Amino acid sequence: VLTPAELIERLEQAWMNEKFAPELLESKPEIVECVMEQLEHMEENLRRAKREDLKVSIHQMEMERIRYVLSSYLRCRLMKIEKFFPHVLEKEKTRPEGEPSSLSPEELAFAREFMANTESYLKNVALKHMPPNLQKVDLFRAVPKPDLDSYVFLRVRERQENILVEPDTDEQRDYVIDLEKGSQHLIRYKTIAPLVASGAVQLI
Amino acid sequence: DEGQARKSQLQRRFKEFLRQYRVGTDRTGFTFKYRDELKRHYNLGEYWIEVEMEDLASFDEDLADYLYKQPAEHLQLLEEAAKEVADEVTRPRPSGEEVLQDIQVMLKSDASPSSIRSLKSDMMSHLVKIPGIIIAASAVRAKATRISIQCRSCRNTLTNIAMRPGLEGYALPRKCNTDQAGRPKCPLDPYFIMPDKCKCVDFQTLKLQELPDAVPHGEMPRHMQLYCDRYLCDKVVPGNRVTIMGIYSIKKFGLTTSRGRDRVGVGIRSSYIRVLGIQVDTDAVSPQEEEEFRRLAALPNVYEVISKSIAPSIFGGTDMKKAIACLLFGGSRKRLPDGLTRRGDINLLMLGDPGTAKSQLLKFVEKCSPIGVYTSGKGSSAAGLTASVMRDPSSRNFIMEGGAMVLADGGVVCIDEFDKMREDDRVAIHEAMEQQTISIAKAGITTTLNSRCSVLAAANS
Amino acid sequence: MDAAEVEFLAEKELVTIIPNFSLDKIYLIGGDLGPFNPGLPVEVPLWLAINLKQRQKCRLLPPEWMDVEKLEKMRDHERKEETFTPMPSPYYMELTKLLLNHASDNIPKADEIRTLVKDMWDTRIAKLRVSADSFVRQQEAHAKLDNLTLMEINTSGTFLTQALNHMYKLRTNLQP
Amino acid sequence: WSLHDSLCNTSYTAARFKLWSVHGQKRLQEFLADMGLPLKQVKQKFQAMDISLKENLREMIEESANKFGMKDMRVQTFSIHFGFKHKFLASDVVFATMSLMESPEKDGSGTDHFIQALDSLSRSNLDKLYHGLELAKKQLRATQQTIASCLCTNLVISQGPFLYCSLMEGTPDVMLFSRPASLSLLSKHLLKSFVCSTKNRRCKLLPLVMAAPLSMEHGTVTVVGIPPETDSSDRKNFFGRAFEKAAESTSSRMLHNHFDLSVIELKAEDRSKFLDALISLLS
Amino acid sequence: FCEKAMELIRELHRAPEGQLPAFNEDGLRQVLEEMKALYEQNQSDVNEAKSGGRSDLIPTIKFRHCSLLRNRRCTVAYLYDRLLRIRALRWEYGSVLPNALRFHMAAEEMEWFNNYKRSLATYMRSLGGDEGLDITQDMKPPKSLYIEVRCLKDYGEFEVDDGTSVLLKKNSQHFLPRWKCEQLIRQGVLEHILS
Amino acid sequence: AYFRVESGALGPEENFLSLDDILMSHEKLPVRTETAMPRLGAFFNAVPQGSKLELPLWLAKGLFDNKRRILSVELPKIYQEGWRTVFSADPNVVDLHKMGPHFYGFGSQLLHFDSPENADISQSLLQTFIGRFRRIMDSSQNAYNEDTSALVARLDEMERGLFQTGQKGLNDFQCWEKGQASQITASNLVQNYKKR
Numbered sequence A: 001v002l003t004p005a006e007l008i009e010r011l012e013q014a015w016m017n018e019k020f021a022p023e024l025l026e027s028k029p030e031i032v033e034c035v036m037e038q039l040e041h042m043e044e045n046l047r048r049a050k051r052e053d054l055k056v057s058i059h060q061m062e063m064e065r066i067r068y069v070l071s072s073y074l075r076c077r078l079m080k081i082e083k084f085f086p087h088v089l090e091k092e093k094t095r096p097e098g099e100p101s102s103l104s105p106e107e108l109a110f111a112r113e114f115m116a117n118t119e120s121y122l123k124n125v126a127l128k129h130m131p132p133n134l135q136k137v138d139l140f141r142a143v144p145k146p147d148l149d150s151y152v153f154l155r156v157r158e159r160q161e162n163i164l165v166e167p168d169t170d171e172q173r174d175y176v177i178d179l180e181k182g183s184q185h186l187i188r189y190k191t192i193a194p195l196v197a198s199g200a201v202q203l204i
Numbered sequence B: 001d002e003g004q005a006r007k008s009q010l011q012r013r014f015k016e017f018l019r020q021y022r023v024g025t026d027r028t029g030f031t032f033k034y035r036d037e038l039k040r041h042y043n044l045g046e047y048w049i050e051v052e053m054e055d056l057a058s059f060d061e062d063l064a065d066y067l068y069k070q071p072a073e074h075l076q077l078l079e080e081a082a083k084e085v086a087d088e089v090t091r092p093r094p095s096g097e098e099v100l101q102d103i104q105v106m107l108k109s110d111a112s113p114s115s116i117r118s119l120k121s122d123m124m125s126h127l128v129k130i131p132g133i134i135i136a137a138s139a140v141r142a143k144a145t146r147i148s149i150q151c152r153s154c155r156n157t158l159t160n161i162a163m164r165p166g167l168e169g170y171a172l173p174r175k176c177n178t179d180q181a182g183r184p185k186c187p188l189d190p191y192f193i194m195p196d197k198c199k200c201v202d203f204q205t206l207k208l209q210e211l212p213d214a215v216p217h218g219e220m221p222r223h224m225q226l227y228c229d230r231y232l233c234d235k236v237v238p239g240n241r242v243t244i245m246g247i248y249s250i251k252k253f254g255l256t257t258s259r260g261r262d263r264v265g266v267g268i269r270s271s272y273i274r275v276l277g278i279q280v281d282t283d284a285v286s287p288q289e290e291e292e293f294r295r296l297a298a299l300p301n302v303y304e305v306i307s308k309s310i311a312p313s314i315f316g317g318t319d320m321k322k323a324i325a326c327l328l329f330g331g332s333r334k335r336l337p338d339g340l341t342r343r344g345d346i347n348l349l350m351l352g353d354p355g356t357a358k359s360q361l362l363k364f365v366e367k368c369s370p371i372g373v374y375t376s377g378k379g380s381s382a383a384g385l386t387a388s389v390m391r392d393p394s395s396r397n398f399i400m401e402g403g404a405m406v407l408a409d410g411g412v413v414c415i416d417e418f419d420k421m422r423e424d425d426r427v428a429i430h431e432a433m434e435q436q437t438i439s440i441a442k443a444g445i446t447t448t449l450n451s452r453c454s455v456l457a458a459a460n461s
Numbered sequence C: 001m002d003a004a005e006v007e008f009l010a011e012k013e014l015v016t017i018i019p020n021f022s023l024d025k026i027y028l029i030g031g032d033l034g035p036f037n038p039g040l041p042v043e044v045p046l047w048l049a050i051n052l053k054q055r056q057k058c059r060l061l062p063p064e065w066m067d068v069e070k071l072e073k074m075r076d077h078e079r080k081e082e083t084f085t086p087m088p089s090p091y092y093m094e095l096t097k098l099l100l101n102h103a104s105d106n107i108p109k110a111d112e113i114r115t116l117v118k119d120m121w122d123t124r125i126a127k128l129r130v131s132a133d134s135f136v137r138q139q140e141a142h143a144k145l146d147n148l149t150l151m152e153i154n155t156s157g158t159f160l161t162q163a164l165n166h167m168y169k170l171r172t173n174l175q176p
Numbered sequence D: 001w002s003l004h005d006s007l008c009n010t011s012y013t014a015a016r017f018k019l020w021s022v023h024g025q026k027r028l029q030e031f032l033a034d035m036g037l038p039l040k041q042v043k044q045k046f047q048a049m050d051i052s053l054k055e056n057l058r059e060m061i062e063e064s065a066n067k068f069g070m071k072d073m074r075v076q077t078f079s080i081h082f083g084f085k086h087k088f089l090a091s092d093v094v095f096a097t098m099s100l101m102e103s104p105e106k107d108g109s110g111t112d113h114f115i116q117a118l119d120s121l122s123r124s125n126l127d128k129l130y131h132g133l134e135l136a137k138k139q140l141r142a143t144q145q146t147i148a149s150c151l152c153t154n155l156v157i158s159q160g161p162f163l164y165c166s167l168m169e170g171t172p173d174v175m176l177f178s179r180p181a182s183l184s185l186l187s188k189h190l191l192k193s194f195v196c197s198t199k200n201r202r203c204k205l206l207p208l209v210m211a212a213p214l215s216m217e218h219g220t221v222t223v224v225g226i227p228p229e230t231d232s233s234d235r236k237n238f239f240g241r242a243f244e245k246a247a248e249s250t251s252s253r254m255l256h257n258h259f260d261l262s263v264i265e266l267k268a269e270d271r272s273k274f275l276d277a278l279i280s281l282l283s
Numbered sequence E: 001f002c003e004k005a006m007e008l009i010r011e012l013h014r015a016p017e018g019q020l021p022a023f024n025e026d027g028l029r030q031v032l033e034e035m036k037a038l039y040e041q042n043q044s045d046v047n048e049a050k051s052g053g054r055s056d057l058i059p060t061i062k063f064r065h066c067s068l069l070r071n072r073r074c075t076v077a078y079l080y081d082r083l084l085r086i087r088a089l090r091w092e093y094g095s096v097l098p099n100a101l102r103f104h105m106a107a108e109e110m111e112w113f114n115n116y117k118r119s120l121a122t123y124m125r126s127l128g129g130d131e132g133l134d135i136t137q138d139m140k141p142p143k144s145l146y147i148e149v150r151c152l153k154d155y156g157e158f159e160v161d162d163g164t165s166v167l168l169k170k171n172s173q174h175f176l177p178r179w180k181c182e183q184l185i186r187q188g189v190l191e192h193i194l195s
Numbered sequence F: 001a002y003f004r005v006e007s008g009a010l011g012p013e014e015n016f017l018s019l020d021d022i023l024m025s026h027e028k029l030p031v032r033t034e035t036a037m038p039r040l041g042a043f044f045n046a047v048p049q050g051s052k053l054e055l056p057l058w059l060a061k062g063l064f065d066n067k068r069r070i071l072s073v074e075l076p077k078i079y080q081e082g083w084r085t086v087f088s089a090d091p092n093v094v095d096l097h098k099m100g101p102h103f104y105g106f107g108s109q110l111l112h113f114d115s116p117e118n119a120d121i122s123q124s125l126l127q128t129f130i131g132r133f134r135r136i137m138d139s140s141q142n143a144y145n146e147d148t149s150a151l152v153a154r155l156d157e158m159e160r161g162l163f164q165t166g167q168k169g170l171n172d173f174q175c176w177e178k179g180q181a182s183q184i185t186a187s188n189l190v191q192n193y194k195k196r
């Protein structure tokens, strides 16, 4: 079991990773549930305290900071879900059992509702009035996919060796580098995405 | 040594002013105003800054006092300090930007101006602030900042000789420094200037006329010569009303009396102003202004608002004030593929009874138009309205001088007393009013000028 | 990320204050904040320090590295070197701004400190500009930026990354 | 401002030099000559003036004023400095705040003018303070012009027990003095100038009643009363109760809305009537 | 050919700040009518190609099919961009829209907005034990627990706590907790005073 | 919270829902017709074989096939050797706004037609971007509270996006340093709706 301070540390780490990643990252139900529970317990405890105290104000300020971080993180995830909904749903549909999910159940319900609402609107406003063979729009092709070739700044948390930098399509130009702990690099996201997933690097 | 120490101390103080000056408060925030401006301008490739005298006085009153009393030396020290600070703000620099550039320091103040008439001898070599109107501008010419000289006989060279700013020359060495032994002596005046070794800046000369309201009763307006250089060059054009900060100075020509100088009076000298800063008076758009203009254009009654703003002192004339608004804005000039042009300017004639504010309307439009010229038909001629051919005093050749409709190009020309104009003079305006050009074929000059102006005329029946 | 969020991150750094009130140990989710006793120093996060100062409850103490001699040595070293040198704090600019804006009465020689921090910031920004120009001009695929702080990266990161994305797409046009 | 403008627009020096007169300008020139200050320097903005003249300015001004019959040129006050630039005397801040609050720019309401004035007192809104300084300069010039118009035309007429001056709608700047606070301050400055510039000894020991138009729709006039102007005045005012007693005895339509009882709103037609009662009440 | 759909696209492109113009009903109907005309001509051409074995008509059929696809693409892009602007409305103003903004939207767009609003409310309710977390608040990092607010317009009663309310009238000032004033500040009803 | 669909013109295919891509593909492109085209003569009744026409890029992309059955495509003059040589001399002085607002996006999509000059078009587009980067970066990050009309006059649509990003970064830091980044303000849309 994590200490509460470590829990807030992981919350901030996920916040920044989601803020800079070009795609929807992996869901973290434990972090969200634990943080919400911590906020609820702190609110209850403060309800037992007197209003005039300095301690109550300090506790409230800390809770405000935690709440802001959680809200911003969830907003970022929701924006990504709305931007790429067909592809998010497709990835979730065909996921292997062992592999971790990128959607919480509630996010999944939200995404399904978003897709159905948008499709029904498009059908009812224009597509039903088009010629019979033009009535189907494949939303999978109409909505752009995440661009995984984006450049990101990262800080190394755990040393990594033999990372393959590919400057272009030509193989002969590709070379290899080392990532040392504490070092900071600017590199394409596609090369280092598994390291973001495992926690070896932090996106800044 | 002692003079060097004093100069170094003053330069250090100027440098500290540039490094440390700040604007703001502890409630809001703070900005290192001049250091930041220097850093941004240098990155943009614009090697100049403008310094407020009040800020310098706030940092160090003695520095401002020295700059006012002895502008030349202390301005040079301030420019050196500016160059030093520009290196520190931008010091690691990208390839092809190794060489540090000189910085021109402009001067600006909030003090009340003084008139041309008030410029007296006791103010010579001082910093002065003068309002006026630009009446003439010269061509852009090259002025040496650094020269290298070479000996005719021995090819001995002296390099990187600094030049004085302004309208001041240089006296070459009389004798060469080569060894007397072995070689036949070098001739007197052995040194010549090496063309390709010279570093030059752009320079300009201007005539500044006194403000019309400042002229004493019954006197012709006076003017003064202005010397501009570097980024001050080509900023103003004839017709601009300006306030200039500068050094009241004297032309330093050769000491010798070459061509047997024979002046009508002895010990007389020619004065001029060495310009250190220019401020154009209303009589680029900031983003705040642009947003405000977009707000005005979107008002549902903008047409009514503009009409109400035209000559608000006149009691009625709502339809004539609406038509003048259209003339001020104008139409769209077009060029068709075949090369034929369609004009976008609007011409308006007021023909009517006496004492109906026709002249007052013309006077307002002169002030309101971005470019506006007021003339009288009685006091005009065909050459005066379009353009004239005359002899150049210096060259002994024919030149061209533009008239009212060349000075009003891109704006409005208000012709009062249009009925009093002679028929031969009126007829000279037909081409300019429609084709918007002036064709000249006289005295060996065959050229065409632009006259894209709107005519606003008034006359009696 | 915007600058307010980098400042939010910077506000989690620990500073020392002397309170004028008494309070028992506080068990914050982030971590315990020791007992507060009038006249004695205690370590708290920067956000709480600023809040207590604004409410007239504490006096702030400058960090150890906020010393004119040390800062002058650091500025000289930064100017001498070619890469980025290690900074006294990962949020030196934000800490300087907050502390000097809110507690200059508590920090002697605040003007000199501000000027030295400004000098360091200018030098490092110029080094970052050189790095970006070299990245684009030489057509690199990767770069190392050690000892660079979050605020420095955030000042021009979006522009550089967008330019690099466009340049990569232009470099990979011909691949079918 | 410039030293010349400050001398011309300060009620103290402006009243003692009688600058509304033709000989007052000559007296001011004599004062400046006694100082040894070049005219072009005193007409320049104080900040831009040469520093050598500023070294002993307060002492020399005090000495010259003493020679010219002004013994109270110097006052104990306070100043505040911050930054490199910002320096203010207390009275400057007072004047700027007053001008922001009593601004004649009617695009903004009076609750809107109150908000501007309150904001200006915070160092974050420094631009508002400078704007208020400019407005204060304009208001001071207007005050001096109105005082000159009143004194030159003999508009301050002595009834038995008090002096009476009435502003008319033909007056140019009347709009700037319709608000009660501006009218009160103007009346005090006018009384000081009048007491300095009058010959009759009796009229120097009288209080003042001043009226100015308020609303041309309802025909209402603002009436203010101030006590006699003396160097040791207790600053005590009896006009509120006198006004209430005159209105009751005469049955005029008066409104007490100002927090000061010496400022009233009166129906213009009743005015004449009102005044007679007041006279009979105070004589 | 596809110039009407190009007008549809240009209208939106000319307003890159996200404002919602009035729904272009006539333009949409024009595009649909053109699509029907193209489809009928193509159908006649296809029938003739089958009947008489004329190969020369195939390029014309391809040309018309491409034109139809272009019209469809422009229509769908226009509608989707409008949906994006409407979605932004929810996060910028709130759950209840001003009537001025409601006027520009089509009825089907209002139905879409209502459905999206319901889905967002459900998700926000599902996060926590009770009432969940309303992630439409806390849009900026917090600094102080309390703030000073000035009323920019008359608004009437405003509930601080269930027990107590305060009357919002123009140019009054209140010292209040930030989390109760954030929404009204974002809507332009209150102004945040810094001193 | 409003983010339009982004351009995909520099990639292998453009984005279906991108307004910029639709406007870009509206632009014309010279073609030569390789087959008689009946019943469309009214719009250019048959169009004879070998005729020369200007078609929108979307229409040319639809009819084009690698074996050149219906039409063959010719490059616009802007992408031919004559102008490529001008670009190499100094890419900073060419006005890419007048020479096609979507200069890079249009040139990128021309590579779909398998011209013999594909390698030269590709290399030119890259060098032009590299040769113009420093000026774009400097002007965007150092023009503060000034008129930028002359700084973006010659930039194309893709470059104007970068310039806006650079200005945003400069403005955000200036606001933070001046203490304006902490005030809670009315939303951007509310400001543009209720005060514009």
Ligand SMILES: Nc1ncnc2c1ncn2[C@@H]1O[C@H](COP(=O)(O)OP(=O)(O)OP(=O)(O)O)[C@@H](O)[C@H]1O
Pocket (backbone or CB within 6 Å): B313, B314, B315, B316, B352, B353, B354, B355, B356, B357, B358, B359, B360, B361, B459, B460
């Ligand atoms: N409608 C008006 N409103 C205000 N002032 C007016 C009006 N008409 C005339 N005036 C004033 O009366 C005088 C008219 O002189 P002005 O030179 O403007 O007349 P004019 O119509 O041009 O006459 P003229 O044909 O004799 O030259 C000016 O003082 C002008 O200000």
Ligand SMILES: [K+]
Pocket (backbone or CB within 6 Å): none
């Ligand atoms: K001669």
Ligand SMILES: [Mg+2]
Pocket (backbone or CB within 6 Å): B358, B359, B360, B416
């Ligand atoms: Mg006339």
Ligand SMILES: [Zn+2]
Pocket (backbone or CB within 6 Å): B151, B153, B154, B155, B156, B176, B177, B178, B186, B190
């Ligand atoms: Zn020699």
